[PDB]
Design a protein around this ligand. Structure first.
Ligand code: NI
Length: 335
């Protein structure tokens, strides 16, 4: 039932999303192709942004005008040295399918690309300073994905207008995933010369973000870790509100699975020295269980509440964020 070009698009989706691909492919009806194409367009944009072999002077024009390449049938980019470069080399195939989408989906995807390109370009030289700047960066690379998705769901009418309307809750969905990834990936990012932890926070502990990798600094590193985890937890009430408003089963699964994965991850990272020694992962069986069970509101709430309990009873009295961590958890639990 797929055209030659759509066949190729799903192949790329599987190459670049692994799974998530199966969850996307389970989306009902018109949502499936819309989300598949949105994901590929975002992957192409992110592939440009990530590629350190592309100079800033070359990269900014590509970021600024990426949204316009969607309407340029022959546009491709042949000089990338990144893992997912096939989506850039074969962009014509993706944009062809994009232009085959209903106009209501095109409008959303183009708007999000435009906005993300501008934001990504703003952050190419600079690192993240304040907590407000952390939220801004996360909005650009992840919050806008949540906003775009929510707008696609409402436009398809498989979800209520409210989903696309409430940009704040949609933004939180994205910020929660992105902050979680940033926290978990401290060491991987360090070894790759990337710095995403906000300076207003870490500079309360060490003189350079890299100092957290030093074993004499483990206590300070964990305090900072716990502070950032506490920050991320503030998004959980919005995540619960967002999930609670979904009436489509395939949408609910698509939305809930990454969020329950993120919470399991934050729970694993909390007060955990191993964050600064390797990549803390969810144990493989457990990850598949959470995926398999993340299917209705009572079940997801029960999961989040259990993980919040595991954090709560691990909070060291001596942690400088201990009071705040307890308070957000009590807030999450009583929703
Ligand atoms: Ni420009």
């Amino acid at each position: 039932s797929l055209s030659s070009s759509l066949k190729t698009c799903y192949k790329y989706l599987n190459q670049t999303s692994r799974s998530f691909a199966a969850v996307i492919q389970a989306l009902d009806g018109e949502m499936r192709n819309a989300v598949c194409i949105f994901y590929l367009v975002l992957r192409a944009l992110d592939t440009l942004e990530d590629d350190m072999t592309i100079s800033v002077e070359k990269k900014v024009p590509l970021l600024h005008n990426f949204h316009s390449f969607l309407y340029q049938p022959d546009w491709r980019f042949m000089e990338s040295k990144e893992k997912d470069r096939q989506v850039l080399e074969d962009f014509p195939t993706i944009s062809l399918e994009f232009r085959n989408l209903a106009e209501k989906y095109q409008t959303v995807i183009a708007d999000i690309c435009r906005r993300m390109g501008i934001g990504m370009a703003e952050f190419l030289d600079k690192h993240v300073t304040s907590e407000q700047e952390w939220d801004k960066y996360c909005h650009y690379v992840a919050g806008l994905v949540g906003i775009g998705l929510s707008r696609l769901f409402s436009a398809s009418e498989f979800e209520d207008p409210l989903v696309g309307e409430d940009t704040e809750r949609a933004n939180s969905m994205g910020l929660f995933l992105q902050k979680t990834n940033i926290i978990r990936d401290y060491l991987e990012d360090q070894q790759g010369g990337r710095e995403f932890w906000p300076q207003e926070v870490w500079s309360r502990y060490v003189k350079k973000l890299g100092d957290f990798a030093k074993p004499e600094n483990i206590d300070l590193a964990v305090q900072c870790l716990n502070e950032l985890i506490t920050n991320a937890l503030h998004h959980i009430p919005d995540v619960i509100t967002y999930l609670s408003r979904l009436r489509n089963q395939s949408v609910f699964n698509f939305c809930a699975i990454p969020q329950v994965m993120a919470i399991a991850t934050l729970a694993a990272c909390y007060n955990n020295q191993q964050v600064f020694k390797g990549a803390v992962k969810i144990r493989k069986g457990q990850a598949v269980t959470l995926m398999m069970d993340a299917t209705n509101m009572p079940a997801v709430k029960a999961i989040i509440y259990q993980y919040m309990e595991e954090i709560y009873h691990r909070i060291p009295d001596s942690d400088p964020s201990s009071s705040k961590t307890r308070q957000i958890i009590s807030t999450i639990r009583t929703q």
